[PDB]
């Protein structure tokens, strides 16, 4: 059978699968009261995409569609009638939680809407509209094919083909950014459907290992970081999709190796459903050498005891 492999990519050559920015570090922590059930960056080791996961970083937290006016509303002054980010038509009966790439965190997404081009004489960046897309709005119903746009800078024109380019998140006085609380993809109208399952270490002494990025925060979190943590980088998702190598067990043993020295820094379990655990207790940011990378070692027995990750 086709052997399973990982791409050979260092920490600085990986992209967050939940927001279009580079991975900055590996980070482990206990779940505590978080339900870890993100919908972007979900893929099995044999290449089955799940949740709202698709292949392009440029589609993650991006939206496309046609605007419609939303009169009588001080927050969502317009709505965006959605397609898939590819431009392909979207049907709410599609077996997805929401259009692929839809944000998978509760709170406010900030970015720029672009629409019909305007003349040079109209002025600077007049076809760039700063907007908030809040999941706590009753208009956040991407499953049903529509989201609310709250304008901050420049007027959004109704009735134009429009693209939303994400820039970061925001926290206002009553809308905390909660990366592990899923949106209600159908708002008040229906329960979420078609979800990739929640994940947890169930193994003694183990914790999830995350690929961590700091997302820009355009309002709030002064002196704090808006972290977004993914289970797989986009490049791993895409690799597994390409390869479709059959999984020979529940767990692939993987090792973080330094090719300069030839040494293994630590080992981890890569689970068939597409997530990583390490042997460690406590919240801990890993320090890895710049040229280091994970490599597939072997398929292991499900009760395999990892060498402690350590400091």
Ligand X SMILES: CC(=O)N[C@@H]1[C@@H](O[C@@H]2O[C@H](CO)[C@H](O)[C@H](O)[C@H]2O)[C@H](O[C@@H]2O[C@@H](C)[C@@H](O)[C@@H](O)[C@@H]2O)[C@@H](CO)O[C@H]1O
Residues at the contact surface with its own copies, assessed by CB under 8 A: 7-9, 12-13, 15, 20-22, 24, 55-59, 85-88, 110, 112, 114, 116-128, 130, 132, 152-154, 163, 165, 167-168, 170-173, 216-224, 226, 235, 238, 242
d(CA 11, CA 257): 12
Q: Residue 75 binds which one of ligand X, its own copies, none, with CB within 5 to 8 A depending on kind? A: ligand X
**Token pair listed for 19:** 């927001």
Q: Residue 2 binds which one of ligand X, its own copies, none, with CB within 5 to 8 A depending on kind? A: none
Min CB(68)–ligand X separation in Å: 17
Phi-psi region of 125 (alpha: psi -120 to 50; beta: other; left: phi over 0): left
Whichever of 75 and 304 has its CB closer to ligand X, that residue is 75
Strand runs (DSSP E) across 158-247, as ranges?
A: 161-170, 206-214, 227-230
Question: Is residue 146 a contact point for ligand X (CB under 6 A)?
Answer: no
* Cβ 118 vs Cβ 129: under 8 Å: no
Question: Is residue 127 a contact point for ligand X (CB under 6 A)?
Answer: no
**Token pair listed for 123:** 């002025």
Whichever of 3 and 121 has its CB closer to ligand X, that residue is 121
Q: Residue 153 binds which one of its own copies, ligand X, none, with CB within 5 to 8 A depending on kind? A: its own copies
Q: Which stretch binds ligand X (CB under 6 A): 86-94, 170-178, 238-246, 285-293?
A: 170-178
Q: How many other C-beta atoms lie within 10 A of the C-beta of residue 222?
A: 7
Min CB(139)–ligand X separation in Å: 7
* Cβ 18 vs Cβ 100: under 8 Å: no
Q: Which stretch binds ligand X (CB under 6 A): 21-29, 32-40, 134-142, 205-213?
A: 134-142
Residue bearing tokens 């259009």: 99
Min CB(202)–its own copies separation in Å: 33
Torsion of CA 20, 24, 26, 29, to 10 degrees: -80
d(CA 126, CA 212): 34
Applying CB under 6 A, which residues contact ligand X? 75, 108, 134, 136-138, 172-175
């Amino acid at each position: 059978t086709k052997p399973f492999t990982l791409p050979i990519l260092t920490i600085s050559e990986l992209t967050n699968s939940r927001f279009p920015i580079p991975i900055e570090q590996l980070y482990t922590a206990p779940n505590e009261n978080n339900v870890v059930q993100c919908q972007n960056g979900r893929c099995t080791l044999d290449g089955e995409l799940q949740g709202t996961t698709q292949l392009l970083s440029s589609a993650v937290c991006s939206y496309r569609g046609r605007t419609v006016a939303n009169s009588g509303d001080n927050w969502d002054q317009n709505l965006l009638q959605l397609t898939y980010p590819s431009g392909a038509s979207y049907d709410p009966t599609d077996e997805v939680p929401a259009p692929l790439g839809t944000q998978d965190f509760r709170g406010i997404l900030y970015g720029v809407l672009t629409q019909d081009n305007v003349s040079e004489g109209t002025g600077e960046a007049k076809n760039a509209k700063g907007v908030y897309i809040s999941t706590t709005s009753g208009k956040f119903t991407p499953k049903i094919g529509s989201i609310g746009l709250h304008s901050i800078t420049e007027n959004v024109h109704p009735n134009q083909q429009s693209r939303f380019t994400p820039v970061g998140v925001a926290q206002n006085e009553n809308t905390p950014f909660q990366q592990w609380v899923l949106p209600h993809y159908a708002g008040a109208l229906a329960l979420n459907t078609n979800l990739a399952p929640a994940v947890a270490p169930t193994f003694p002494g183990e914790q999830l290992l995350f690929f961590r990025s700091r997302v820009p925060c355009v309002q709030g979190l002064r002196g704090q970081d808006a972290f977004i943590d993914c289970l797989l980088p986009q490049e791993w998702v895409n690799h597994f999709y390409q390869e479709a190598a059959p999984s020979q067990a529940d767990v692939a043993l993987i090792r973080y190796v330094n090719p300069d020295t030839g040494r293994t820094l630590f080992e981890a379990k890569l689970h068939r459903s597409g997530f990583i655990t390490v042997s460690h207790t406590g919240a801990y940011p890993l320090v890895v050498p710049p040229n280091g990378h994970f490599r597939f070692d072997s398929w292991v027995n499900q009760f395999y005891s990892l060498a402690p990750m350590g400091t």
